[PDB]
Design a protein around this ligand. Structure first.
Ligand SMILES: O=C1C[C@@](O)(C(=O)O)C[C@@H](O)[C@@H]1O
Ligand SMILES: O=C1C[C@@](O)(C(=O)O)C[C@@H](O)[C@@H]1O
Ligand SMILES: O=C1C[C@@](O)(C(=O)O)C[C@@H](O)[C@@H]1O
Ligand SMILES: O=C1C[C@@](O)(C(=O)O)C[C@@H](O)[C@@H]1O
Ligand SMILES: O=C1C[C@@](O)(C(=O)O)C[C@@H](O)[C@@H]1O
Ligand SMILES: O=C1C[C@@](O)(C(=O)O)C[C@@H](O)[C@@H]1O
Ligand SMILES: O=C1C[C@@](O)(C(=O)O)C[C@@H](O)[C@@H]1O
Ligand SMILES: O=C1C[C@@](O)(C(=O)O)C[C@@H](O)[C@@H]1O
Ligand SMILES: O=C1C[C@@](O)(C(=O)O)C[C@@H](O)[C@@H]1O
Ligand SMILES: O=C1C[C@@](O)(C(=O)O)C[C@@H](O)[C@@H]1O
Ligand SMILES: O=C1C[C@@](O)(C(=O)O)C[C@@H](O)[C@@H]1O
Ligand SMILES: O=C1C[C@@](O)(C(=O)O)C[C@@H](O)[C@@H]1O
Lengths: 143, 143, 143, 143, 145, 145, 143, 141, 143, 143, 141, 143
């Protein structure tokens, strides 16, 4: 039945190898498994996608319009730079939860700005991969 | 195992104050939800709400070494109080910052949080469910 | 018909503190002038001054639904307190901001007011007569 | 025989027709009548002028030097843009009360700044046309 | 049917003589003729005014309230400076198209801010005097819809 | 004679479905049809491309260098963010008209900045899809002169 | 023969009466006399105009195009606010010297900005009325 | 001859809080040091620490006309309270500002002090010895 | 057998044709040949890639992790806008030399900022295509 | 009566350095012109040019009480040196600041002058004639 | 045991320059005060004042490894010289920054110090007594 | 054919000062490396290091018209000296800016260079090898 769009942006494929002091030793496979297990608890399915390509994420949002209950998004660095990604989230009309493994507000000033936070129903930061589980919980209860 | 639940100024008005922004749940609903989630991990909650910054700072000092972590919604003090950030550091409690609303979608002066500099995680816009996720983070860090 | 009159920190020192800026009138004079003006309109005033922000916040909360409006001189909190603006909003009282001095003629840090965002009216530099006009605004809104 | 200069800047001739949700349904004729009635209570006269030309207000201020007890001015949009009008108020040496029908601090950021507030003895905003009655009362008592 | 208010602000009277490398060699009379001819294609008339005096522009906006279908405005330097002129456009209640002969966003930073852009339904910049023809076309079609 | 490059950036494929209170109920196909019909009035043709992929827009600009008389571009959100897209317009050497359906200067502050505006000969904003028709008219007349 | 356009903007008519601590006790008549005497030394004439009206100054610049050797301008407060005045100076094509009786850079921050300095051949500030004499000297030698 | 010694929020935690920044000395140590320096000049010290800004403001109001001066470590209120500045001005007390750490070597939000606008002197980074220097300044004024 | 990743970002395929007054008449093929010849002098190989797609450079950086001695990157306009590319360089763990044909600091202000300079071991600007020869020399000696 | 003429760094290159900006006159031409003008008022000039800030500061200290004023073109030190402003204040010389070019028409970093805070007058863009006007100001202040 | 005492540009004019701000004490007074405080702790003071930044930099370079610390009043260089900061770092000397006035109560351009980033301690507004406190800080380090 | 090699303040301390940032090479090593590289191209180097800005300025002036170019590491003057940029411009030498460290990776005050506005090339973070590349740029421009 209900489907959640799980979108991971640039560099998320490198989770577990990239800056482990900041992002931890968990993998993207762990993220998808955790979100899928949480959704299954609520009778929902997860359609997951990761890409270093902003255009692929936008295409995914457009394609999910009208057919998914919501979106869990970790835009990566696009969080602080893409108005196009924000416009895509708005075009999707999907209730969207923004997730960050790290706490961007405890990092460089350029990470303190998120175009997505303008459209997101909720923002979860610094909870590690557990943020994805909470994000699924939010969407399952909005629905 | 004990979690300190701290709600700052105006949170006693939850359910009455600006319901289009903060919703129709109450501070009692917040405390009962954090309590129910803490019980799933075999923990208890010590809850305090105050309109007085000094009472929150005294509560953080008093919890040092005796609590496993702090769930804090500093309210307006989020954006203004260095003294509260120094109190969180002095407590040495792992701290999750919660906001009912999404401050990044509101006025520019709400985009700045002193507490986000020290918090292990920040949850915004999830309504009262944010407090449930914050207990989950603290129970799993301690674990 | 009751007007909440709130004076913030340091206003107890009116007549002694910086008399070249604030003049020689006292807080007693302020309360008496506001009381006499309210009486002309069949109204009473409940007055409170405090060096504690939490006491002002508690007063706004306690006056919700029972008072016709608030006259507030926030003192130095004018420039610093988001929590006090949130309390004015939680109170749902039509609020007149009063400053004895003209803050726009003083240091740059006094040019910004959180309360001015939510106030129905702002009166500055009329001395203690500003409290008389503030009562007249609230009595006529009530009419 | 004591005389007050009442100045209304650009667009105030449209009072009652322009943006009634912001400025109300009263007219410029109502404003002048209200100021005149208040002045008469104190044995004072009001010389009123409105113009869509900044130069006309400056001329009026110069011509009033030494012959008027004070000035009540609503500069309109000139409030946020004219250093020339500020210099004129100072050249006049007239005690000046700045009046705004609306509360500019509750509006767009460009309206939060006033050159005239730097020289005004008092600033009244958001009291509707009653602000002009309070302004006359201030001048009659300074005198 | 109906009348469009065409307003040109300070210095536009100097069109063809002032900084021709930036503003071109056409005159203000060419602008008015072009706007009038475009309006005529839609059975509309144009009341044109230019002034170095901001108050005259404000008076023209006040006087046009309720009797014109819209306003085409090139505020000149007042674009970047006048809150009073924005308040006058709001008081007019006229649907307004802002026109610039040059492309202000390709010029000095102080030209990158427009008060009028906050109220205008459309902004046309850098089309030379042809921007006034497009502005009449927008107002003719808003009115028709 | 000649061909105009019409480029639409990210999200424009969603025209008619995305935020219709801001962008209207016309489709991207209506935009292309309108531009093509205007071009035909001048004996010109239009090569139209839309993509959510910035690289595709850059490739289209590179490929159009020397063979097209000009470019009409609605960069979408890339307007506010992409230096790479400005560098591509410069590399194209095409006279460029920037078009926005909405009036970005009446929206959020982050929409008030355009890299493309630094290179465009003209900028048209808030005319709905009619801005693309005016943009073809500008390019048809620059080419004629 | 050669003619210099001397333009004095808003408030300059008040020279000698306005803020004498800042602007001195000399009059506008003194300014015109001094400039006229200096020009006469070089076989030149001065066409002087003062107005509180920006439109009058712009009209004067347009009218002087092609018939004057240059312009001496004290724009008053328009110095820090008018792009229209700058555009007019450029349209005039007149070599222009900007003159300030006071030193604006030793005053409020808003006086530190001049649109005219962008077009002026020279800027003279703080020399009192003597600045006008120097300005005539510059234009007589450019010519 | 009496000096008002005011310590702001969190200073009660001196010795336990962020010892790599504030050291291992305690508030008791600060009060003893200031009291001994004051006694060398025949002066006494009325000391108060509070996490409650209103209490510090009341203390300043009550010391008006009775004290030779004030030594103040406002804590985080240093960067946030106009009210505390207004209180210092209302006190009319010559005031020395003291910081155990050097705020200018820390986060930008700590580079701003409202009290520094009114203080006769500002001492930073000298640890608890700053309080001894501050007493010396008020004694020689 | 030691391998250097040579990355050229958007528009660099147009080298020799685009803005020749700024970037010169040399081509991308010249750049790759120059880097390759320099690498061969040190017994090293160069794997070169250019793309108008940010995602392709990110993919290339990820794929090169652990298998290359370093990276020479000219990000093009991505230099001033992509946090994702910076995160990618860090994920790669490759010593990276940033190269600009032009001197961006001598150009528009928006070109004065580089995200890549935050992670690069070295930055070479304005040496034309010789910058790529110097970059290879840096990597060959760090190695 | 003696005037101190101080020229800062690079002014020895006048006539060679950036002639499109500074013209074709020399530092010798500057000194001879100031000398000729000082002689019309019965004064002498002591001229020093140095590329060393310390030598200018020593010259200001040494002129204290013995000179009637200072004509200074600080060169690049205009925009950067607080030490030079403190030296001008320590000298107690009435000081006229001269610039050959118009800094307000150049790069933003040239729009700031520490010396303009202390100077009685500032002359910019008049070429070497500025020095002549500066001597005239000093001769008439002393008079 | 030797302390390097460095005074920057204009400090030679102490007593004559802006006496309403800097007081009537002289540079000779500052050096004597610091020297006497140093002698109380069995230490000596090598003092230098200069209007030439290069001389101050050379002094810091030459004191590397030979001095217990540095007391510095950089004058206007405080708000302008990265070179002087680089010199302090090159010296490796524990450094106390001293200001006779309180720069935070003055013009905004005086609110910024490059030296405050490297200094162990900053003392402002105590007049020439700041130098005595600075010697005390280095002696107890 | 002669290259002016200028090293600014503190560079005499290379190898002792902050070795974790600048490394263990000495100023002698810098001069010897630059000298050997120049010799390969039939060129010589005239080297100067000073803790005095005026000495560097004098050197640039003295090298005008006789040297083929300048290699400059301005030290802390990079971030602070307008007078040094004006000297580079007065010299008319094609100039390469060299930094041993990568200033973009360090404190914000080190991110700004006056010399970078005028330099033909900027090389940062290559250690002392940056001086070798700088000589190679100047020799090939000369070719
Ligand atoms: O790519 C990432 C990861 C991130 O989104 C996170 O999950 O923490 C935070 C971003 O700032 C960063 O660019
Ligand atoms: O008091 C509150 C409530 C809040 O903390 C929240 O929960 O959303 C957000 C704050 O900005 C505000 O001042
Ligand atoms: O405490 C006060 C009094 C005040 O609010 C007034 O009444 O003028 C002005 C405030 O700036 C100041 O901090
Ligand atoms: O013209 C007006 C009217 C106004 O002064 C008022 O009365 O509220 C407020 C101004 O911001 C505006 O430009
Ligand atoms: O006066 C004008 C003309 C203008 O409005 C235009 O038409 O291009 C642009 C304005 O910036 C300038 O001040
Ligand atoms: O994508 C779009 C559409 C737009 O370019 C327009 O056509 O109005 C305006 C942009 O700000 C926005 O990001
Ligand atoms: O009106 C004046 C006079 C003035 O131009 C002068 O002559 O000093 C300076 C201006 O700042 C001021 O607004
Ligand atoms: O509370 C404190 C302690 C402090 O005042 C000090 O003593 O160093 C410094 C402040 O920045 C901080 O908030
Ligand atoms: O694409 C490029 C080329 C460039 O990186 C260079 O090589 O100089 C400089 C960048 O600013 C520009 O966007
Ligand atoms: O050195 C100079 C010359 C100068 O002072 C002038 O005379 O125009 C202007 C300064 O900005 C520049 O640094
Ligand atoms: O030269 C000095 C003296 C000073 O350092 C002091 O001692 O107070 C303060 C500095 O701001 C000023 O430039
Ligand atoms: O003195 C130096 C050395 C330096 O120029 C370098 O070589 O890296 C970098 C500068 O920031 C610093 O002040």
């Amino acid at each position: 039945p209900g489907k959640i769009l799980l979108l991971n942006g640039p560099n998320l494929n490198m989770l577990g190898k990239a800056e482990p002091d900041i992002y931890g030793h968990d993998t993207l496979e762990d993220v998808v498994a955790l979100a899928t297990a949480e959704a299954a608890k609520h009778g929902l399915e997860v359609e997951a996608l990761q890409s270093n390509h902003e255009g692929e994420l936008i295409d995914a949002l457009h394609n999910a319009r009208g057919t998914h209950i919501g979106c869990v998004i970790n835009p990566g660095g696009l969080t602080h730079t893409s108005v196009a990604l924000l416009d895509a989230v708005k075009a999707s009309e999907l209730p969207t939860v923004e997730v960050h493994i790290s706490n961007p507000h405890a990092r460089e000033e350029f990470r303190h700005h998120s175009y997505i936070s303008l459209a997101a129903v909720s923002v979860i930061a610094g909870a590690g991969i557990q943020g994805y589980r909470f994000a699924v919980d939010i969407l399952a209860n909005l629905k």
